[PDB]
Amino acid sequence: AMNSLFASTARGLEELLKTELENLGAVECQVVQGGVHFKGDTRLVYQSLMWSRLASRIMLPLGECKVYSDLDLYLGVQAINWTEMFNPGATFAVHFSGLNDTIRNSQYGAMKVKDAIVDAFTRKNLPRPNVDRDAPDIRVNVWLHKETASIALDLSGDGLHLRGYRDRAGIAPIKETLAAAIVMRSGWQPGTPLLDPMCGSGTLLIEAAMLATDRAPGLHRGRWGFSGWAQHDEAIWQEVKAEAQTRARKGLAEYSSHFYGSDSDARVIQRARTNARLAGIGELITFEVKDVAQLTNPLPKGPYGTVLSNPPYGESEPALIALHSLLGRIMKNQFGGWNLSLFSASPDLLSCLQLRADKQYKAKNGPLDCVQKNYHVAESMVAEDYTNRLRKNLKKFEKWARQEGIECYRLYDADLPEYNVAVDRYADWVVVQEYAHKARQRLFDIIAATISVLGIAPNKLVLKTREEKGEFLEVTEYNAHLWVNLTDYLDTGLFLDHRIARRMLGQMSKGKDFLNLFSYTGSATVHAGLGGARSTTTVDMSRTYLEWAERNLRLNGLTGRAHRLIQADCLAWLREANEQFDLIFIDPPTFSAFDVQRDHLALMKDLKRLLRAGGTIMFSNNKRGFRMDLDGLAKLGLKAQEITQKTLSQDFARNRQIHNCWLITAA
């Protein structure tokens, strides 16, 4: 006999499958979407079941028909000689994929086929065979495409990816058949060291070890689809089985190289170790619990080999960027001369390695697009532009900030126009704020470089992207304690560039009645309050920012009747108000119905009504090119002394946005 077979595989693997079938004897192989049709004699059927590492399932087409009625399928199914095919007492199951105008539901199709099969027994007065979906002895597949159903015996039984070293469920993050592909694409030469420092369940390393010691994927499988079937040939199966034993033993006894796996998670490593032991190859592989950060080359004196792995992906994250960036640095340092292959769902994260891949492959892993890329690591740059600038600013501002008593400040303010980003330090945290795949990888480089210059821990870096759950952070500004939130708002709750105007209010405050309009989180009120203000009044339209202001006042012991918070539109509040204040801070947005340039004079007109004799208004804004109407003011009997230069902090000295600042008083 010449038999006709079909092997299914994952899309993308078909050509690799066909070569593997050919290498083991198969003839007339033709790739097709999701599989390979092939031929060989009966030893060849058994040899492909035992030996194929890429096949998901191997089956035997039994026939095919057109399906234009429940009847056609029924007739079509009964053409095949079931009663003679089943061993006595064999259980069965039917899996049916695909649909047409008559079989509009798959489970329906599986049902009609199952019924047609049972009816081959009824019509010959035989005991009806039972179904066992869990572990049938006979599995029948049918594939319906366009108008044709194709029926086939599944010879694999369980999927061929189960090699007998795991759990039949299971759910591996990478199927065994895909992991064997990855090893084949990796450039890894069997017989040279292989290492995976993020090894998970160890699957990559176990497939590799089995491939390299000629250990058949089938060697340890406990069950096959051919055992319930009458045409089965035990003596040929026995001969394939004994050929497998012989080759495994020699493969193992002769292998002289080694496999190294490591992973940070102690649970997976215990599973990796039991898996490998059950694969038969456990003596060839060493697993340890170890972070990529302490990765070392166990063979510093050679021979070179391959580092093969499947890193975590963004399931933008600073921790991932840092993990990829450090891996590249460790490759270069520890594994010069070696081959590197990586399977990832994030090409952008692979770019953080700072290596150029000389080969790549696309593969689906379930629903996810992944790539595998291979690289050569040279024997014995990185936005050095930004790096040097940032190391400079760091030396400069760290010292300046220590002298001034400042712990939140701007480390970098788009100083180089090709690295157009702000980096703000808040105590032990850092926020990088973007302004600007090409783009994304440049951003990643900036993040890697900034994590590396600062010596900061990745989880303490927050990325605010060009494109709200959690936590507030307590910070100081000279003597104020303030709450910030680095992630949930467009801003952090503290406008850092205005710290000096804030410190000044605090010096001008002793026994003063203070008013703060457009107060935001009330940081200026906290400075006034701690300067001995006799009462503070803090106003803003936002209930959230007023709650946050109150929490800031509370943080510095400023509670009770003397410290008020008022939710209002500040302009209508100004129209109607009567009380008087000695010190007034008003620092509005440029627009909100309100226009600072247009309306400032009319604010000063109302503010005048509220300013107690001898009092001062500190007015500020950040409208670009703002013009103070000095004539309007003098007409109101007010004068204005610009203090903009005196209130400029060093960390913001080169910034475009100018925060203009004025002391207004009685003429």
Ligand SMILES: Nc1ncnc2c1ncn2[C@@H]1O[C@H](CSCC[C@H](N)C(=O)O)[C@@H](O)[C@H]1O
């Ligand atoms: N910093 C670090 N050092 C070492 N291992 C890490 C790490 N960060 C994450 N990991 C590990 O990286 C792994 C990525 S998932 C690996 C899946 C694996 N190839 C398989 O076939 O089963 C996880 O096991 C996680 O524990």
Ligand SMILES: Nc1ncnc2c1ncn2[C@@H]1O[C@H](CSCC[C@H](N)C(=O)O)[C@@H](O)[C@H]1O
């Ligand atoms: N018409 C209006 N009346 C009252 N508050 C307003 C407003 N329009 C905007 N605001 C508030 O103005 C603030 C702008 S942020 C101003 C910065 C703030 N003065 C500080 O010292 O930190 C926000 O808190 C916003 O809610």
